[PDB]
Enzyme design. Structure first.
Site, PDB file in Angstrom:
ATOM      1  N   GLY A   1       5.853  -0.876 -30.052  1.00 30.46           N
ATOM      2  CA  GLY A   1       6.793  -0.322 -31.015  1.00 30.46           C
ATOM      3  C   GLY A   1       6.626   1.154 -31.311  1.00 30.46           C
ATOM      4  O   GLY A   1       5.511   1.670 -31.439  1.00 30.46           O
ATOM      5  N   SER A   2       7.754   1.835 -31.428  1.00 32.92           N
ATOM      6  CA  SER A   2       7.765   3.192 -31.922  1.00 32.92           C
ATOM      7  C   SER A   2       8.295   3.195 -33.347  1.00 32.92           C
ATOM      8  O   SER A   2       8.987   2.255 -33.772  1.00 32.92           O
ATOM      9  CB  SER A   2       8.642   4.077 -31.051  1.00 32.92           C
ATOM     10  OG  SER A   2      10.004   3.694 -31.145  1.00 32.92           O
TER      11      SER A   2
ATOM     12  N   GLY B   1       2.786   2.474 -30.853  1.00 37.63           N
ATOM     13  CA  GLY B   1       1.942   1.379 -31.324  1.00 37.63           C
ATOM     14  C   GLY B   1       2.257   0.039 -30.711  1.00 37.63           C
ATOM     15  O   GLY B   1       3.327  -0.539 -30.945  1.00 37.63           O
TER      16      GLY B   1
ATOM     17  N   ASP C   1      -6.003  -3.826 -38.960  1.00 41.18           N
ATOM     18  CA  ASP C   1      -6.133  -2.541 -38.313  1.00 41.18           C
ATOM     19  C   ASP C   1      -6.256  -1.427 -39.331  1.00 41.18           C
ATOM     20  O   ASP C   1      -5.561  -0.408 -39.257  1.00 41.18           O
ATOM     21  CB  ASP C   1      -4.939  -2.308 -37.410  1.00 41.18           C
ATOM     22  CG  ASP C   1      -5.104  -1.103 -36.516  1.00 41.18           C
ATOM     23  OD1 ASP C   1      -6.237  -0.816 -36.059  1.00 41.18           O
ATOM     24  OD2 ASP C   1      -4.080  -0.448 -36.265  1.00 41.18           O
TER      25      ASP C   1
END
Ligand code: 19Q
Length: 281
Positions: free
Chosen positions: A21-22, A18, A132
């Site tokens: 970032g994980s 994302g 989102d």
């Protein structure tokens, strides 16, 4: 604890990616004997300025959020940096809907809808725009319980404004975005309502790929973003999902009111969904 020592967080697998970032499945194992609890740990995979400050904010935001229908913050950990969260083994709702389809009537979809609305109501009351909202970003606590996740793009609304203007373009699938976001990068508690409309559509299509949001604009037929804007301006909308009860389609269509200020609030939506849920039975 509120504070996790990195040396005790033990890696197990990937759960998601994302922007920069994980999120990973880790065992928090101070004994080192595999008897420790499971946790979902988010780190950034890029070390620049604005993405690091944004990540800190996301932590500040989620820390200060207390709701049965929001993913739960457990703590942070440091190196000299990581966000530790409750772990939900049933995972993603988008996927869960696709798997358990034959086990879920309209009540349950309405039950989830109500729960998401309630979480969004609360989010709105903290002045937090999610930005989102979408089935892929909702987690399953259990068969009868869902929670909003992925605050990677969430913003706090300044006390004196009710909308945020984003400088750069968005990077999420275009089909969950309000028109004012598409044209002007304006996000708000009401653009969140636009997308909640799309989440409902996802609940009632059980996130089926063949009639997804993307698949439909495609069918409904120059840059994609521009065409989607023309359509939505002409007043084209996603159709009633197959078998969708009408009353729910209307709520969607209402969430899709052209101007943000004609869209109903989450606190208006909540009772209606509640009445619907006690309506099917
Ligand atoms: C990848 C990211 N996930 C999180 O932040 C998650 C936080 N707790 C979780 N438990 C299970 C899962 C499993 C679904 C991976 N994910 C997460 C999201 C789904 C919100 O995009």
């Amino acid at each position: 604890p509120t504070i996790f020592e990195e040396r005790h967080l033990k890696y197990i697998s990937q759960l998601g990616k994302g922007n920069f970032g994980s999120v990973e499945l880790c065992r928090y194992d101070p004994l080192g004997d595999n008897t420790g609890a499971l946790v979902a740990v988010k780190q950034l995979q890029h070390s620049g300025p604005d993405q690091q400050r944004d990540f800190q904010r996301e932590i500040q935001i989620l820390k200060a959020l207390h709701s049965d229908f929001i993913v739960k913050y457990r703590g942070v950990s440091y190196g000299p940096l990581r966000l530790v969260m409750e772990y939900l083994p049933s995972g993603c709702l988008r996927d869960f809907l696709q798997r358990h389809r034959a086990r879920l009537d309209a009540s349950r979809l309405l039950l989830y809808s109500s729960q998401i609305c309630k979480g969004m109501e609360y989010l709105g009351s903290r002045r937090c725009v999610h930005r989102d909202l979408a089935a892929r970003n909702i987690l399953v606590e259990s068969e009868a319980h869902v929670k909003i996740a992925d605050f990677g793009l969430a913003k706090l609304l300044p006390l004196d404004k009710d909308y945020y203007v984003v400088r750069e373009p968005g990077q999420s699938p275009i089909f969950w975005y309000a028109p004012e976001s598409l044209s002007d990068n304006i996000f708000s508690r009401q653009s969140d309502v636009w997308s909640f409309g799309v989440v409902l559509y996802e609940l009632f299509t059980y996130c089926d790929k063949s009639c997804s949001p993307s698949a439909e604009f495609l069918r409904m037929m120059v840059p994609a973003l521009s065409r989607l804007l023309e359509l939505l301006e002409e007043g084209q909308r996603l159709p009633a999902p197959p078998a969708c009860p009408a009353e729910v389609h209307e709520l969607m269509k209402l969430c899709w009111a052209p101007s943000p200020q004609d869209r109903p609030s989450f606190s208006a939506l909540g009772p209606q969904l509640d009445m619907l849920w006690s309506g099917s039975r």
